[PDB]
Design an enzyme around this catalytic site. Structure first.
Site, short mmCIF file in Angstrom:
data_model
loop_
_atom_site.label_atom_id
_atom_site.label_comp_id
_atom_site.label_asym_id
_atom_site.label_seq_id
_atom_site.Cartn_x
_atom_site.Cartn_y
_atom_site.Cartn_z
N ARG A 45 27.66 65.09 129.08
CA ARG A 45 26.95 65.17 130.34
C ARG A 45 25.80 66.15 130.25
NH1 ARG A 45 27.13 66.55 136.61
NH2 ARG A 45 26.71 64.45 137.34
N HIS A 49 21.99 65.21 131.12
CA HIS A 49 21.21 65.83 132.18
C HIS A 49 20.00 66.60 131.66
CE1 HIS A 49 23.82 65.49 135.98
NE2 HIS A 49 23.80 64.37 135.29
N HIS A 172 31.03 57.04 131.07
CA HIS A 172 32.02 57.38 132.07
C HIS A 172 33.46 57.04 131.68
CE1 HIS A 172 29.02 57.94 135.62
NE2 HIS A 172 29.03 58.96 134.78
N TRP A 188 37.73 58.20 135.41
CA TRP A 188 37.42 56.79 135.38
C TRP A 188 38.47 56.03 134.62
CZ3 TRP A 188 33.64 60.55 134.85
CH2 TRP A 188 32.57 60.52 135.72
C1 HEM Z 1 23.57 56.24 137.96
C2 HEM Z 1 23.82 57.16 136.87
C3 HEM Z 1 24.81 58.21 136.92
C4 HEM Z 1 25.35 58.85 137.98
C5 HEM Z 1 25.05 58.72 139.46
C6 HEM Z 1 26.29 59.79 137.46
C7 HEM Z 1 27.08 60.68 138.21
C8 HEM Z 1 28.06 61.54 137.72
C9 HEM Z 1 28.88 62.38 138.54
C10 HEM Z 1 28.82 62.49 140.03
C11 HEM Z 1 29.74 63.04 137.69
C12 HEM Z 1 30.82 64.05 138.01
C13 HEM Z 1 30.35 65.48 137.73
C14 HEM Z 1 31.47 66.39 138.13
O1 HEM Z 1 32.00 66.34 139.26
O2 HEM Z 1 31.87 67.24 137.27
C15 HEM Z 1 29.44 62.61 136.36
C16 HEM Z 1 30.11 63.01 135.22
C17 HEM Z 1 29.84 62.61 133.90
N1 HEM Z 1 28.72 61.85 133.56
FE1 HEM Z 1 27.69 60.59 134.80
N2 HEM Z 1 26.34 59.74 136.08
C18 HEM Z 1 25.40 58.77 135.69
C19 HEM Z 1 25.07 58.45 134.39
C20 HEM Z 1 25.59 59.01 133.23
C21 HEM Z 1 25.09 58.77 131.90
C22 HEM Z 1 23.90 57.91 131.62
C23 HEM Z 1 25.89 59.51 131.06
C24 HEM Z 1 25.75 59.72 129.61
C25 HEM Z 1 25.35 58.74 128.74
C26 HEM Z 1 26.84 60.20 131.88
C27 HEM Z 1 27.88 60.99 131.40
C28 HEM Z 1 28.83 61.68 132.17
C29 HEM Z 1 30.01 62.34 131.66
C30 HEM Z 1 30.43 62.32 130.22
C31 HEM Z 1 30.63 62.91 132.74
C32 HEM Z 1 31.93 63.68 132.74
C33 HEM Z 1 31.69 65.20 132.76
C34 HEM Z 1 32.96 66.02 132.81
O3 HEM Z 1 34.09 65.51 132.69
O4 HEM Z 1 32.81 67.27 132.94
N3 HEM Z 1 26.63 59.93 133.24
N4 HEM Z 1 28.39 61.69 136.39
#
Ligand code: HEM
Length: 291
Positions: A45, A49, A172, A188
């Site tokens: 993540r 970002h 995800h 997820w």
């Molecule tokens: C429409 C696009 C996306 C939205 C709205 C989105 C939104 C989010 C949100 C709300 C979280 C939770 C953060 C938290 O509460 O700790 C999250 C976690 C995460 N996102 Fe996405 N995301 C998107 C695209 C992506 C992409 C493109 C990747 C990487 C290729 C990604 C990788 C991750 C990972 C690995 C987590 C887990 C982080 C953790 O467990 O600490 N996301 N994302």
């Protein structure tokens, strides 16, 4: 504005493999983080970002400058929780002070994906730290409470097409939402620290109910204890995304290949590699090295 990749002086593949290895060994060591999910997901993540601020129209943001190290960007509400990833990387940077911040942030994501049994992600060095005034303003990362049309339009700014978007969102499979960070809660899937195509399988095979969480936001929940954000679920509401979700649910290798390409692209957006730059590096995992 053009950002030309500049190899950290005198460094080559072996230097960066040592950085990879240090990241990988610390991922193994600090296994208890986030109820034993470990730091892999948050590093993925963080790579996303730090890269996902890019704007194709003017080449602002992106991975090159490593600007997350500045307070405007690390305090972006969209980045809440990523401080854990940065803290992870601090001892790595101390040991290897010669690597640029952008190279470290991006390499942390590559390392995490590979160590979590994901595809190989070719990676290129040469991001150069840029000054504090080059930090992009908050608000370039996507909202989760939106529909497929939002997603599609959002990712045009990052020069991603439908297949690239759907492939990238397969990340995800990893980690979870945390209510205090984003206003969403839950994982997820079940294999939270193993990179697989499970995101797509769960989208198609679970029984999803649209519920409100404890932060008063809607999310899709299953009886298995999984969740999908509205933007995740939009991939099965839109007929073009849905076909690609079905493809990746039915072809692990294809997902791996497409993810690898899209994730490298995401991490390289905005960067001009000179003709005589080194070829992309493909790092060996710890397991491959017998370490
Ligand atoms: C429409 C696009 C996306 C939205 C709205 C989105 C939104 C989010 C949100 C709300 C979280 C939770 C953060 C938290 O509460 O700790 C999250 C976690 C995460 N996102 Fe996405 N995301 C998107 C695209 C992506 C992409 C493109 C990747 C990487 C290729 C990604 C990788 C991750 C990972 C690995 C987590 C887990 C982080 C953790 O467990 O600490 N996301 N994302």
């Amino acid at each position: 504005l053009v950002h030309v990749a500049s190899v950290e002086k005198g460094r080559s593949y072996e230097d960066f493999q040592k950085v990879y290895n240090a990241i990988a060994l610390k991922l193994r060591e600090d296994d208890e983080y986030d109820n034993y999910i470990g730091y892999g997901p948050v590093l993925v993540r963080l790579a996303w970002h730090t890269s996902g601020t890019w704007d194709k129209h003017d080449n602002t943001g992106g991975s090159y400058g490593g600007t997350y190290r500045f307070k405007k960007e690390f305090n972006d509400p969209s980045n809440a929780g990523l401080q854990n990833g940065f803290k992870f990387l601090e001892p790595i940077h101390k040991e290897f002070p010669w690597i640029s911040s952008g190279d470290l942030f991006s390499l942390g994501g590559v390392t995490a994906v590979q160590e979590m049994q994901g595809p190989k992600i070719p990676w290129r060095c040469g991001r150069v730290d840029t000054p504090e005034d080059t930090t992009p303003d908050n608000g370039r990362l996507p909202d989760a409470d939106k529909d497929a049309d939002y997603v599609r339009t959002f990712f045009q700014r990052l020069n991603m097409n439908d297949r690239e978007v759907v492939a990238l969102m397969g990340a995800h499979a990893l980690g979870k939402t945390h209510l205090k960070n984003s206003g969403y809660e839950g994982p997820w899937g079940a294999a939270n620290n193993v990179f697989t195509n499970e995101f797509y399988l769960n989208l198609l095979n679970e029984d999803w109910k649209l519920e409100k969480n404890d932060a008063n936001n809607e999310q899709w929940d299953s009886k298995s204890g999984y969740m999908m954000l509205p933007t995740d679920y939009s991939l099965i509401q839109d007929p073009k995304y849905l076909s690609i979700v079905k493809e990746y649910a039915n072809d692990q290798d294809k997902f791996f290949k497409d993810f690898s390409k899209a994730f490298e692209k995401l991490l390289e957006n905005g960067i001009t590699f000179p003709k005589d730059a080194p070829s992309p590096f493909i790092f060996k995992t710890l397991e491959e090295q017998g370490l």
